[PDB]
Amino acid sequence: GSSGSSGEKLHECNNCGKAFSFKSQLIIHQRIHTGESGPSSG
Numbered sequence: 001g002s003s004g005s006s007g008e009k010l011h012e013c014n015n016c017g018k019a020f021s022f023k024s025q026l027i028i029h030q031r032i033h034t035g036e037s038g039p040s041s042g
């Protein structure tokens with residue numbers, strides 16, 4: 001939640017309100033909102 005959108009908004013996050021100029025990128029970010037699945041860490 002911080003104002004600072006650069007470049008064209010090709011893919012925006014319909015959860016927090018972020019923007020990504022790469023479909024894949026956006027998907028990688030949305031992971032924070034959803035439950036991921038990987039190795040144990042932290």
Ligand SMILES: [Zn+2]
Nearest residue numbers: 013015016018
């Ligand atoms: Zn988001």
